[PDB]
Amino acid sequence: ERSLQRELQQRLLATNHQLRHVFIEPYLNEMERQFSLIYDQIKVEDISGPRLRNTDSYLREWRLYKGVMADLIYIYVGTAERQMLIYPEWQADADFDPRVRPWYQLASQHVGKMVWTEPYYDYTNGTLVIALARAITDKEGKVRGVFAVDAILAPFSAQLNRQWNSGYQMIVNQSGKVLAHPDPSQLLKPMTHPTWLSRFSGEDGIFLDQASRQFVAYSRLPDHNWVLISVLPASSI
Amino acid sequence: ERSLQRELQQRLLATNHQLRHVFIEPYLNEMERQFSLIYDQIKVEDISGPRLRNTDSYLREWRLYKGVMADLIYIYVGTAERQMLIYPEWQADADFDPRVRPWYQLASQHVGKMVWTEPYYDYTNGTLVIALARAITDKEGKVRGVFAVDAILAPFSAQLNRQWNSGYQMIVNQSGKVLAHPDPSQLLKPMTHPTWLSRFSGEDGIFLDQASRQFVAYSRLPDHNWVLISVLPASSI
Ligand code: PRO
Numbered sequence: 001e002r003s004l005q006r007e008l009q010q011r012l013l014a015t016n017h018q019l020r021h022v023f024i025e026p027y028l029n030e031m032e033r034q035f036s037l038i039y040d041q042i043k044v045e046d047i048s049g050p051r052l053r054n055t056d057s058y059l060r061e062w063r064l065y066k067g068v069m070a071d072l073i074y075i076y077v078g079t080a081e082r083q084m085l086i087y088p089e090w091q092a093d094a095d096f097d098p099r100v101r102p103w104y105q106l107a108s109q110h111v112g113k114m115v116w117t118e119p120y121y122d123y124t125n126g127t128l129v130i131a132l133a134r135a136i137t138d139k140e141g142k143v144r145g146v147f148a149v150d151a152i153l154a155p156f157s158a159q160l161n162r163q164w165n166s167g168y169q170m171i172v173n174q175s176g177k178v179l180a181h182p183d184p185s186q187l188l189k190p191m192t193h194p195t196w197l198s199r200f201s202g203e204d205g206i207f208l209d210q211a212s213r214q215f216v217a218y219s220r221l222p223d224h225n226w227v228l229i230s231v232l233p234a235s236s237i
Numbered sequence: 238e239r240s241l242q243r244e245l246q247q248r249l250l251a252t253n254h255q256l257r258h259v260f261i262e263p264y265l266n267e268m269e270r271q272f273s274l275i276y277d278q279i280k281v282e283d284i285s286g287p288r289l290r291n292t293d294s295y296l297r298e299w300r301l302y303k304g305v306m307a308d309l310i311y312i313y314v315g316t317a318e319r320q321m322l323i324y325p326e327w328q329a330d331a332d333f334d335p336r337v338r339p340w341y342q343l344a345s346q347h348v349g350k351m352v353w354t355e356p357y358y359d360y361t362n363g364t365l366v367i368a369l370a371r372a373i374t375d376k377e378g379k380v381r382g383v384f385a386v387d388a389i390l391a392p393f394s395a396q397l398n399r400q401w402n403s404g405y406q407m408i409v410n411q412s413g414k415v416l417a418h419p420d421p422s423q424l425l426k427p428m429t430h431p432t433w434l435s436r437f438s439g440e441d442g443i444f445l446d447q448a449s450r451q452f453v454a455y456s457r458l459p460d461h462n463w464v465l466i467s468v469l470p471a472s473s474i
Pocket residue numbers: 074076086090101102121122123124150
């Protein structure tokens with residue numbers, strides 16, 4: 001009868017918790033651990049000076065890291081000396097100032113930790129991206145530079161949604177922008193049902209969107225201000 | 238001249254360290270963290286008794302986990318009451334005793350920690366596999382059961398070797414059996430050049446196999462008794 005929608009919501013919610021707990025959180029945690037391992041290989045002295053030293057070394061490293069972190073688009077460091085080192089090849093103007101860019105700014109105002117930006121447009125070719133960034137420092141809080149990676153979580157998104165026919169799984173940020181989704185063309189754009197943000201009450205839950213006839217389970221991520229959404233259209237086997 | 242082989246070995250060694258440090262160790266660490274998250278969801282009471290309770294729940298969980306841990310073949314628990322719960326579907330004899338199997342035995346003699354077996358043959362269909370296992374306990378060291386996963390690291394192996402044309406990357410265990418390799422048919426079998434085990438001096442190094450004209454870099458893994466081998470045939474661009 002209608003108890004079908006009972007077991008169905010509790011299952012959709014259980015799958016959302018399990019996916020969050022054993023896939024999403026371990027995936028992000030490793031990516032951020034790998035980020036910190038790359039970051040710790042960076043010596044301030046190589047980048048607090050007018051010219052960059054030992055760059056051939058970091059670009060050799062970064063090419064290798066990108067080769068196994070499939071969500072990454074660029075790995076780079078901008079410096080307070082307006083230097084910019086980047087793999088792969090990226091060109092910018094001479095009016096380009098790294099220090100004014102959102103990854104540089106967010107990282108500077110949270111020294112000692114990494115931080116994820118809102119989606120923003122690449123300075124040169126305009127592409128939507130998201131950055132994870134951390135400030136490089138030297139002494140009494142002198143920010144000599146900022147290390148960051150541009151990412152588009154399409155590989156992550158595909159693995160999240162691999163086993164999911166019928167439903168789909170998405171992740172949204174604090175403002176409803178799509179961090180992960182089965183369709184690459186929706187990434188980093190606003191979510192399709194913005195009213196859902198006001199239904200994400202508490203750390204998790206389930207509800208039914210009578211407007212789009214979709215069951216919606218949601219779980220909040222602990223260390224990031226994001227929400228995992230499991231969606232099951234009332235079109236169901 | 239011959240200084241080509243100089244920069245070449247130091248580069249092959251540098252790539253081996255970087256791959257070990259930023260890919261292999263974070264990959265294994267997440268897999269073992271995900272293992273422990275699955276393991277901690279297991280309540281002794283469900284499995285220290287003649288019959289298993291709430292099995293529909295664990296098989297619902299395990300199907301989901303397998304769906305995102307691509308190296309896994311089976312997820313299971315055997316009990317000291319000779320019960321066996323397993324996803325996906327696995328049949329055995331009535332002469333099957335989990336307690337005598339290598340994952341059960343290794344896990345029982347290292348309670349409180351996880352452990353990787355040597356490669357061994359599936360009881361029923363004979364297939365070569367490797368297991369990660371941990372004992373489930375209750376009080377003064379009563380081993381009520383053992384939780385374990387069968388794995389074949391082909392997905393891991395493909396990601397390790399994705400970016401590598403020219404050379405290849407492999408991982409061997411304490412006894413030279415192949416844990417990871419570009420060719421799936423070599424997995425879990427003895428390495429092709431067993432003499433290399435005696436050249437893996439110390440925590441890392443490089444040497445040249447004059448017999449197979451291959452440069453060989455090696456790095457030992459910290460928390461596992463294994464070796465990462467980067468091989469570059471003297472056939473080179
Ligand atoms: O647009 C930016 O600010 C960053 C810099 C490197 C690539 N994208």
